[PDB]
Design a protein around this nucleic acid. Sequence first.
DNA 1: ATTGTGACGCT
DNA 2: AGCGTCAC
Length: 425
Amino acid sequence: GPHMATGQDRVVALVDMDCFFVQVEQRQNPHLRNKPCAVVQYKSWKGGGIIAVSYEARAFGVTRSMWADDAKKLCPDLLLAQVRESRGKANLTKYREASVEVMEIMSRFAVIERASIDEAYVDLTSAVQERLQKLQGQPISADLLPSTYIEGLPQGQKEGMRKQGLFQWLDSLQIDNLTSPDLQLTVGAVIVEEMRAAIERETGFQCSAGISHNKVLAKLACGLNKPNRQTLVSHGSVPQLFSQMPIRKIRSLGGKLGASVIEILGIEYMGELTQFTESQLQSHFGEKNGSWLYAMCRGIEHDPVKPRQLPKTIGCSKNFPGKTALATREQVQWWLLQLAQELEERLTKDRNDNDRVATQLVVSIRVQGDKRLSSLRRCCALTRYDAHKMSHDAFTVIKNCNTSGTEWSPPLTMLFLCATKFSAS
DNA sequence: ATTGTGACGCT
DNA sequence: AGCGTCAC
Ligand SMILES: Nc1ncnc2c1ncn2[C@H]1C[C@H](O)[C@@H](COP(=O)(O)OP(=O)(O)OP(=O)(O)O)O1
Ligand SMILES: [Mg+2]
Ligand SMILES: [Mg+2]
């Protein structure tokens, strides 16, 4: 009743750049704009692996993780942009720098949590209070929400429907109550329209967004209407939305835990979780997961938007599949050196930009014929930004995996160097 | 022969 | 610390 808190205390947004690597390449090369086009890494094995897909190309069935030769079978006019290769490996610097452009603009409006290269959460609670008291009571015009969908409306042409739903929502709004969560979400959506407009004006990049009361709902909302649109998921919309929502669509339930929720409880949709007690869920999935599930099937989640605009780790990884697996000492050293040289470049730039130094080096490998993505992960001290030293140290830390009696056995199918444990500098 | 990331939990 | 999960 009155004492049942409803998870309506915050306004949270999730902003995701539409097919981001594709947009970066389309800005750089206007011949690629408004076309079926994809970004690919490498080119020799089956045309390269596709890692990003424009919405025009998705309409033909082109997806990430597809070989370019196969995507061309589905879409013969598919245009391709290749990731840069440096020191023998893909180098994602152009996309990291484009991401910083976008994150820096987002940070003008509110505090952000960089979730990935192309996604950030936004804590809009204080921004909305400021904008509300600036309003001083006047209603919110549909004109301020030109690309917003209100999930679940209308009830009782796509753009026509969008506007019908938005009118129904705005007519219902009690503007005089500055504490109404629905009003707070709406003002959040206004600010996110402004944020997205600034991003597109100042970078050329388009993005979609979700606006709700917590991170999981905002991310779910963001997926509902892409590309170049934003979706408001109100607390009231959760029962109908979750009633037919596959459990795997909720963030963190797309993997083995989600599968076990489905298998153990014999359900399919998020809303079905409401039938279980908190203790029942904890008994199946542990104290933390159980409490989290109990609240989240009711629309409630308390994970904070962390004030963190920069990555916590700086990593350099390469897979060596098939007959390209590394089999000699010289080979393992030369690739460790290539990785360490890219890492040194990125670390020196990071220290200059962001006033910090990494203090720990993580070295991870995969051996041929191991079924894990990671076979071993050991750390050592990272004391200076020297590629020769970092590569010698990573070797020193992995060398006792060689079981040869100049040769390397078993052959290595992945190398990975990660700088971690930053401290202010 | 999805790759190259990057965040977080468990013990 | 080292390993595992999750989401791209
Ligand atoms: N599995 C992956 N491997 C490599 N790069 C990836 C992978 N997933 C995503 N990326 C990169 C390329 C994408 O442009 C960028 C953002 O990923 P993501 O947001 O899932 O898709 P997207 O931005 O390409 O399209 P969407 O419009 O659906 O968001 O990160
Ligand atoms: Mg995206
Ligand atoms: Mg994303």
